[PDB]
Amino acid sequence: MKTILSSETMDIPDGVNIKVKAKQIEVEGPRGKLTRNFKHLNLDFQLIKDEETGKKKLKIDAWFGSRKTTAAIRTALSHVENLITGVTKGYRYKMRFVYAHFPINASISGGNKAIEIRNFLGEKRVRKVDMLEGVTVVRSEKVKDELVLDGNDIELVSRSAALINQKCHVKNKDIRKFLDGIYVSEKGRIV
RNA sequence: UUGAAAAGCCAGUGGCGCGAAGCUACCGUGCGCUGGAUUAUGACUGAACGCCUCUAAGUCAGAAUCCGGGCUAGAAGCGA
Ligand SMILES: [K+]
């Protein structure tokens, strides 16, 4: 029914710099740089500075927006929160190898930017996966048959994990019985 | 049949054997191709709906599929 004003605000930690211009959000922190293009959202983004204190707030609002349009405000705020988390703490995904008979042989290429899977269900084919930008994959030493993906972009890290998982799908078998694969087991922050 | 020999000719290709050349047969030989976008499907982050959610915004992989490329032709189209 076109609610007049739907607004939501988020606090910004003092250790992160943020710039907004034409719905282009630039985030800077100790771990590096992140960028997002929110041009596809018909929302108004504003950065409020507290002169007396010096703190930062990001306010996103929609005017005369329907429910569908208003649903994007929280999405944008969560995306900005994820950017801040990635630039301050970073993102770490953990994957575990699951197999019944054939151990999965994983080889990490140079730079921790590519992975080779060789013995999935005793298959002679070699599966190649390349990590996305800013995401590095390593083989854990404290946990058996575990892969650690570290990055600054939650979306890129999760997409790399999804690529690894989907590259090892079982076919022509009852997947309920043949549970072999590589699956995401934990999501968290590097620090 | 030309007197004979030799050498020819007629029987509309006289008949038979071999027969080069050309043509020709899976009856012989050579060759027949790879970038993008996507369907179904499976997923990422993510609200709506403080949780959840492949979906609402955004995003990924994806086919004897489509498009392009390659091959054939080359327009009251054109260049040096
Ligand atoms: K989800």
TrEMBL record:
GO terms for cellular component: cytosolic large ribosomal subunit. Residues 12-90, 102-181 form the Large ribosomal subunit protein uL6 alpha-beta domain. SUPFAM superfamilies: Ribosomal protein L6. Pfam families: Ribosomal_L6. The keyword Membrane does not apply. The keyword Translocase does not apply. GO terms for molecular function: rRNA binding; structural constituent of ribosome. Keywords: Ribonucleoprotein, Ribosomal protein. One of its GO terms (biological process) is cytoplasmic translation. PANTHER family: 60S RIBOSOMAL PROTEIN L9, 60S/50S RIBOSOMAL PROTEIN L6/L9. Belongs to the universal ribosomal protein uL6 family. This is 60S ribosomal protein L9-1.
